[PDB]
Design a protein around this ligand. Structure first.
Ligand SMILES: [Zn+2]
Ligand SMILES: [Zn+2]
Lengths: 153, 126, 474
């Protein structure tokens, strides 16, 4: 029931005053699911990219974190091609950090933020993480091409 | 009716105490010749707000868990013992949350845990 | 070039691979690191080859086994490789570490000591080997000085050297699994205790837990003497600062509870605690006990075995508190000599003052304690100074504790009130002035309460023909 109230508030707050470069709407195809979009960050290889996400709010939400996937392939140290995100706020604690103090808006913000500043210590793509650590240019090139291949129109 | 009713205060551990103490010391000044409001004013030594409504039309006295006012009759009553949060909750929602946590230990009819928003000690007595 | 070692291993042992070592010779870094970055499943197989390929029967297998180890320690550490590969590769480095001769493992352990000095031990998953190697050194009883002596000096060098402030706890969780002596466990934990000082508070509790589970095969006197001497200093410094409270109350408590769940399974832990907190002669009780020692005891009263023992100590000490001070305050000669250490009522009350931050276990002990004192030292001599005053004074205390307790803990003040009424009602078989005098000052401070406890006063009135008059009146 905490589901119903959370969804009602967050949906309309995200429809009228979302965080900038982020959108989140009730998936038309799946009005239990959400569709999220992250716009390609300025001064990143993800620049000129529209990254679609499937945002499922578990039935125990907000006591449990959202289950969110990238639908857009991304070249990222901490995010595999299938869209899985290595980020503590998508898991219950002591390992994760989810609580109803946080929400869809603040976690989509933490995601756009990680997209800006990858954390190499939770690597999903070891190759991408070592290339990010040693060969910034190759990573930036492959990721920007990735943006123009997958996050384009 | 004019006789003393059964009385109590919901709210902040830091807010509720001085009301209890003032009630204890003054209750003899209670007098059943007056009205209940005219007796409350002199016992609790305050005047009441009359529906402070329009100013704070989205201030969120709501659960801060379900983010709603009015859960199945229930109202956000349980608060934080903190000046910086003051974040209200439901009995229902705070029990359901705190049950899960490692940190949370249950004594007889009470649960100690961390306030969701500020992670400070908060107590729930069922 | 990975599918020219799979073939080599697929047939026979130490025939082509012991030579295949001497052929390549270049460096098992490119063959693991860059091979891992693409596909680590190879590395989990690969290592099965090299190890079967480099059997320790020969020294040119052994120094190829001593280098691959020095490599894969350093790559799992510095490397942001997956958890999943590390859960395997370490698995191997453990599974194979059993059958080594002496002087290689002391050098691997010297690498480990060097890492605890400096190295970025970003995961102590690297130190998961450090338990089993001190095992495998001890099982080889042959002079390299024997294996156990080398182990002793090795864990002395672990203790003497500086500990990574970040993961000191994780290092102390490793001596959990090794078999040790007394001296060894004592050395390691007194250093883990030197480390509480140079930490944040919120991580002291789990460290204390991992000290106690070690202390289960080691020193208990020491573990609890450390926690007590530490918090004793802490609370004294908090006091003279008042002349970080809202969390100092969480720690003291969480600790008392964590030491509870242990004395629960370890009946000897409780007995060593209790022996440590004996009065005996009253001069040990004026260096031993505390405002923290006593919250801890008055949690302990909840253990079924332990309630009684505990209380009896507190009560008997309580009296001496009155008797020292009473006999002291007769005399100036005594006041000249002793520098007056705060006395035992005070301490018990400062607990009660602390209590607010709602460690609600201590309360069962207080209430239990409180009526023990009055039921014990009540007016019945009166229906001297020696057998009178430090029993009245005791009674006063009982009363004093409960009234102050009643003021603070809204939860309890139902069953203080009933437990009073109980002793008030059927007696005047025995005197009960004291209970009514309390009963006054209870209800005087906050008599809303009896609105909540109304059934109970209703069924004190159903004895209000049999009750004698002076009682009924008051
Ligand atoms: Zn709620
Ligand atoms: Zn709070």
């Amino acid at each position: 029931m905490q589901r119903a109230s959370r969804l009602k508030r967050e949906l309309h707050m995200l429809a009228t005053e979302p965080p900038p470069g982020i959108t989140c709407w009730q998936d038309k195809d799946q009005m239990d699911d959400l569709r999220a979009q992250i716009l390609g960050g300025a001064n990143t290889p993800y620049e000129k990219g529209v990254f679609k996400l499937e945002v499922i709010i578990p039935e125990r939400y907000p006591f449990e974190p959202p289950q969110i996937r990238f639908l857009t392939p991304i070249y990222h140290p901490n995010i595999d091609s299938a869209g899985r995100i290595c980020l503590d706020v998508l898991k219950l604690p002591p390992k994760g950090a989810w609580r109803p103090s946080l929400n869809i808006a603040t976690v989509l913000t933490s995601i756009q933020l990680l997209m800006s500043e990858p954390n190499p210590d939770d690597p999903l793509m070891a190759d991408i993480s070592s290339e990010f650590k040693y060969n910034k240019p190759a990573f930036l090139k492959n990721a920007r091409q990735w943006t123009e291949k997958h996050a384009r129109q | 009716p004019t006789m003393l009713p059964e009385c109590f205060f919901l709210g902040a551990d830091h807010v509720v105490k001085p009301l209890g103490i003032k009630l204890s010391r003054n209750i003899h000044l209670w007098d059943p010749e007056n009205s209940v409001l005219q007796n409350l004013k002199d016992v609790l030594e305050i005047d009441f707000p009359a529906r402070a409504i329009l100013e704070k039309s989205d201030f969120t006295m709501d659960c801060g868990i379900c983010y709603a006012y009015q859960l199945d009759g229930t109202i956000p009553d349980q608060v934080c013992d903190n000046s910086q949060c003051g974040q209200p909750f439901h009995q229902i929602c705070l029990y359901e949350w705190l049950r899960g946590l490692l940190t949370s230990r249950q004594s007889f009819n009470i649960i100690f845990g961390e306030c969701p928003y500020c992670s400070k000690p908060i107590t729930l007595k069922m | 070039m990975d599918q020219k070692i799979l073939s080599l291993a697929a047939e026979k042992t130490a025939d082509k691979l012991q030579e295949f070592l001497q052929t390549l010779r270049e460096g098992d870094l490119t063959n693991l690191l860059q091979n891992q970055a693409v596909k680590g499943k190879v590395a989990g197989a690969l290592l099965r080859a090299i190890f079967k390929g480099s059997p320790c029967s020969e020294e040119a297998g052994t120094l190829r086994r001593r280098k691959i180890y020095t490599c894969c320690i350093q790559l799992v550490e510095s490397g942001d490789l997956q958890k999943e590969i590390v859960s395997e590769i370490i698995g191997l480095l453990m599974l194979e570490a059993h059958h080594f001769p002496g002087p290689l493992l002391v050098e691997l352990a010297n690498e480990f000591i060097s890492a605890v000095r400096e190295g970025s031990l970003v995961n102590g998953k690297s130190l998961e080997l450090l338990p089993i190697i001190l095992t495998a050194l001890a099982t080889k009883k042959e002079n390299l000085l024997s294996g156990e002596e080398c182990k002793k000096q090795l864990i002395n060098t672990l203790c003497s050297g500086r500990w990574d402030q970040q993961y000191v706890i994780q290092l102390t969780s490793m001596f959990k699994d090794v078999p040790l002596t007394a001296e060894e466990v004592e050395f390691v934990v007194e250093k883990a205790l030197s480390m509480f000082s140079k930490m944040n508070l919120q991580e002291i509790p789990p460290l204390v837990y991992q000290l106690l589970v070690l202390s289960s095969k080691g020193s208990r006197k020491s573990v609890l003497e450390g926690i007590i001497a530490f918090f004793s200093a802490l609370d004294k410094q908090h006091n003279e600062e008042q002349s970080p409270s809202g969390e100092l109350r969480h720690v003291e408590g969480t600790i008392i509870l964590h030491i509870v769940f242990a004395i629960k399974l370890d009946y000897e832990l409780g007995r060593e605690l209790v022996k440590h907190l004996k009065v005996g002669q009253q001069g040990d009780s004026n260096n031993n006990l505390s405002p923290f020692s006593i919250a801890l005891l008055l949690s302990v009263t909840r253990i079924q075995r332990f309630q009684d023992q505990v209380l009896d100590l507190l009560k008997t000490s309580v009296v001496k508190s009155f008797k020292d001070l009473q006999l002291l305050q007769g005399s100036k000669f005594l006041q000249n000599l002793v520098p007056h250490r705060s006395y035992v009522s005070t301490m018990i009350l400062e607990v009660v003052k602390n209590s607010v931050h709602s460690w609600d276990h201590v309360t069962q002990g207080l209430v239990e304690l409180g009526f023990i004192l009055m039921d014990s030292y009540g007016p019945k001599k009166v229906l001297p100074s020696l057998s009178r005053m430090p029993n009245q004074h005791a009674c006063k205390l009982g009363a004093n504790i409960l009234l102050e307790t009643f003021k603070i803990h809204e939860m309890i003040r139902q069953e203080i009130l009933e437990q009073v009424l109980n002793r008030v009602v059927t007696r005047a078989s025995s005197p009960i002035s004291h209970f009514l005098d309390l009963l006054s000052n209870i209800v005087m401070y906050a008599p809303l309460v009896l609105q909540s406890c109304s059934s109970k006063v209703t069924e004190a009135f159903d004895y209000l023909s049999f009750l004698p008059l002076q009682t009924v009146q008051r």
